[PDB]
């Protein structure tokens, strides 16, 4: 008997991906889900997780690669590795030099999800839905306050987003940038933010309970699709703003103590087949990292510039740099101060 234990994000695979794989290979898949980088990272650090494959964000690889939790990927066992987009491989390679440990899986940005109808009512037909001004100017948040404003509970992405908006380095290594100008703007915005949460905005957007959110691209598009399936007339859309946004990448990695390496490699190469990962993108509304798969993705998804951004939008994206622990601790304390007062 052959078995394979996978640990992936919630809502990050198609409903029949595992079943198709099991039909094709005869391998028993045990599939478990998390919904936070810290829950996965806290299992990885305790060791002996029992997982053969896990899906961390690329920025979390650097911290974990120095701890020696993953083992290098045998490229010869992945003949379809050549299907991966080389540009995405280079961006992930900033956290994983020579792409030794991680296979790019899906990627997206952190932008603005919003209720199209609610925003136009409150802010007029010319609401700045293409700008962070929509959610980072107090004058606007005061108007959108009553219809619901939410921010991610993510100090790394929110501070980077605020810094970029103010004209600073999105990955500034200067402590005063976080406690000074970034905290000032966040404190001005705070009284108009209903909550800081990294998943409640999804269903809230879909149901009409909040009208604007800082959120992950594919999760906002899932909320938009949920409202469409529910036939509730709620029109959710998503915006990568003109000032740029953070792009991030989730990757498959193999723990060093994985018991089913052969089966793990079979599943990776399975994912590299163009139709397998195109099918996932169709259902989760995230762009996969496979360049051969792109034309196979449904037109509604691949021609959506908020999922597959064109070259001009990609040029405005920035990525997460791993900060020195000194700056991590400054970020956490300031975030706590922002969320309270």
Residue numbers in the entry: 29 to 369
Direct quotes from the study:
To gain insight into the evolution and designability of ligand binding and specificity, we analyzed the homologous PBPs, PotF and PotD, which are Escherichia coli putrescine (PUT)-binding protein and spermidine (SPD)-binding protein, respectively. They constitute the first elements of two separate multicomponent uptake systems (PotFGHI and PotABCD) to transport the cationic polyamines PUT and SPD across the cellular membrane. Still, the protein-binding modes differ: PotF shows affinity for PUT and SPD, whereas PotD exclusively binds SPD. Prior to this work, we grafted the seven differences in amino acids from PotD binding pocket onto PotF; this resulted in PotF_SPD, which will be referred to as PotF/D throughout this work to keep naming for mutants more concise.
All prior observations combined led to the following three constructs: the basic double salt bridge reintroduction E39D–Y87S as well as E39D–F88A and E39D–Y87S–F88Y. The removal of this Phe should allow Tyr to flip inside the binding pocket to accommodate PotD-like positioning. We also introduced F88Y in the basic double salt bridge mutant (E39D + Y87S), thereby hijacking a bulky aromatic residue that already points toward the binding pocket to introduce a distal PotD-like Tyr. The highest affinity was measured for the double salt bridge mutant containing the additional F88Y (KD(SPD) ≈ 5.3 μM). To our surprise, all solved structures adopt a PotF/D-like semiclosed conformation. Also, SPD adopts similar positions to the one in PotF/D in all structures. In the highest affinity F88Y mutant, the newly introduced Tyr slightly rotates inside the binding pocket but does not directly interact with the ligand. It is involved in cation–π interactions with R91 and can stack with N65. The second salt bridge residue E184 interacts with D182. Whether all these constructs can completely close in solution remains elusive.
